[PDB]
Every structure is written in C-alpha cells, then in structure tokens.
Structure 1
Amino acid sequence: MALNLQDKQAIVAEVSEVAKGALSAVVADSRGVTVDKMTELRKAGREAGVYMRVVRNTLLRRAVEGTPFECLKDAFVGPTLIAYLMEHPGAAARLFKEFAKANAKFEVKAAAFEGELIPASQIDRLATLPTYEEAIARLMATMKEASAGKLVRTLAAVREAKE
C-alpha cells in the first residue's frame, strides 16, 4: 500500500469516473460471493467488457470525501458498506439493469438502489434508460395510433358489448 500518495490515488484516478461519468450505481454487497465478479465481469464478455468497474471503495472518507468534482447531496450518499459502479464508453442505459435484474434475485442486498449521479438526487430506482436501442419500443410506441389503439376498443363493442 502507501499513505496519502496511495490514498489520493484511489481517489482522483477513480473519481474521473465521476466527473466524466456515464451512468451511476451504489450497491452494497454484504455476503457477496465470487460470482459477484463472475457476473458484472462475466456479462463483460459477450455483452460488456472492461468498460465497467465496481471497485468497492466505500472508504467514504476516501470515496465520499473524495468527490470534489461536483456531486452534492452525497454527504449522505456514501453510507456504510458500498461498491460504487461507473461507465466510460457506451450509453448510460443498460447498466442499471445488470443490477436491477440480478440483485433482485437475492444476490445480496442491493442498497435498495439508493440512486447516484447524472440527474443527481436520492433513492427510488428508474428504468427509462435500458429501453434504449430497443427502438421497437418507440415503434409500437405509436400503438399504431389509428390501428391497435382502435382495434383494442373501437372493436371491443362486439367481443365485450353485445348483450
């Protein structure tokens, strides 16, 4: 290891993933297993990569105190055990799901998704992101307007209104 010369290191070096941070997630991992690194690191194979890091650095005094790069409301955002996660390339979508559709399956606590940066707020997960590049969600998103949204009601008077 090393003192300040090493402490400062883990800081700025990784805090760069905060200044120029794509997405953002804070998940504790009490009772985490190796699959913990056989997942966010496995999905990094044929659907991710070295573009993701969850360097458990909840040293707070290091992680939290180490975020002068504007991330207010975080003097609270850094409680107990933590394992921050950030992105560099790619979009700012998916990622939340790697956690949302993993930790939801036991896989240790998920900090109930305390939310992180980007919009900069508090706790209460969202998902308006992973719907990206799933353009067909913007396709049927018109609900055929005329069609479907019609053949669903304007023609429901027959299979549900003839008495």
Structure 2
Amino acid sequence: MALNLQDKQAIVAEVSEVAKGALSAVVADSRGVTVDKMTELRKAGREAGVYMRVVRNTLLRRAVEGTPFECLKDAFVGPTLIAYSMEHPGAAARLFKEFAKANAKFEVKAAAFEGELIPASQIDRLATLPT
C-alpha cells in the first residue's frame, strides 16, 4: 500500500462491483473469526460465487467516494462499519436471507438491520426477495 495508485486500485475494483450490482445487505463482525468466514465465504462460493467480496472499508471518505454516483443513499452508512454485500448474479437474490439466518445464530450486532437499497426505502426487513 504505497499511495492513491493502490488505494484507488481498490476503488477501481469497487466500481466494477457496483457496475453490475443493484441490492445490498448489512453486516458487522467486530468479533468475526476465520472459521466464521471460512464458511460464510465458502457458502458464497457455493451459492452463486465469490462476487460478494466483503468490503469493510465503510469510511465515509473511503468507500463512499468509491460510488457517490450509484446508490447515493449510502451516506449515513459511514460509522458502525457495514459491508456492502452486493448481489450481482440475480438482482434481489436470497443472499440477505441466508445471513438473516446467521443473524439468529451468530451475528451479535447486525449493524442496524433495515434492508439496503432498491425498495429505495428503510427499516422494514426485505425478506420478499425472489429466491
């Protein structure tokens, strides 16, 4: 990690993820273990792929600069780190619902679960996604 050559390099990869993505989920594992992601990222690679690259760079001046053009409503996501869980293959897939089940087992804090964009709304839990 030298400078904006590589910092924005992550931002370039980030813009590619928004290029095909529509919907997102909230998650905050501030106690997250390897074993946690050794299944949850394995489940991603089994469900529909490794497209869900868990980005915990929720800084308002970092990740938000990555996409002020698309999904503008992500402003107040800055504090209390939330990973933009994008859904590329199949808009509105069951990716939110599977971490919702993990929300019951071990996701102590769900970073204020409210349902991300494309209802273009809030708080009401989006379980009505075409599975």
TM-score bracket, shorter-length normalisation:
0.7 to 0.9
| Superposed CA offset, 1:3-41 (max 9, x none) | 111222222321332242142112111211112312221
Q: Which SS does the other structure have where 2:110 is aligned? A: coil
| Superposed CA offset, 1:55-106 (max 9, x none) | 2221331112321223223221232222221122234221011211102213
Residues 15, 66 of structure 2: 8 Å contact kept: yes
Q: Give the number of the structure whose residues are more often helix, by fraction.
A: 2
Q: Give the number of the structure whose residues are more often strand, by fraction.
A: 1
The alignment's TM-score, normalised by the length of structure 1, stands at 0.67
Residues 29, 83 of structure 1: 8 Å contact kept: no
Q: Identity of aligned pairs, percent?
A: 99
Unmatched runs of 5 consecutive residues or more in structure 2: none
Give every structure 1 segment of 4 or more consecutive aligned residues whose post-TM-superposition deviation is greater than 6 Å: none
**Structure-2 change in CA distance of 1:45 and 1:17 (3 Å):** closer
1:68 aligns with 2:48: no
Unmatched runs of 5 consecutive residues or more in structure 1: 131-163
Residues 103, 110 of structure 1: 8 Å contact kept: yes
**Per-residue deviation at 1:120?**
2.7
Give the whole-Å Cα distance in 2 for the aligned partners of 1:69 and 1:16: 13
The alignment's TM-score, normalised by the length of structure 2, stands at 0.81
Residues 80, 111 of structure 2: 8 Å contact kept: no
**Structure-2 change in CA distance of 1:102 and 1:67 (3 Å):** same
Structure of larger gyration radius: 1
> How many residues are paired up?
130
Give the whole-Å Cα distance in 1 for the aligned partners of 2:102 and 2:8: 32
Q: Which SS does the other structure have where 1:110 is aligned? A: coil
Give the whole-Å Cα distance in 1 for the aligned partners of 2:100 and 2:28: 13
Give the whole-Å Cα distance in 2 for the aligned partners of 1:76 and 1:41: 26
- Structure ranking higher on relative contact order (CA contacts 8 Å, 6+ apart): 2
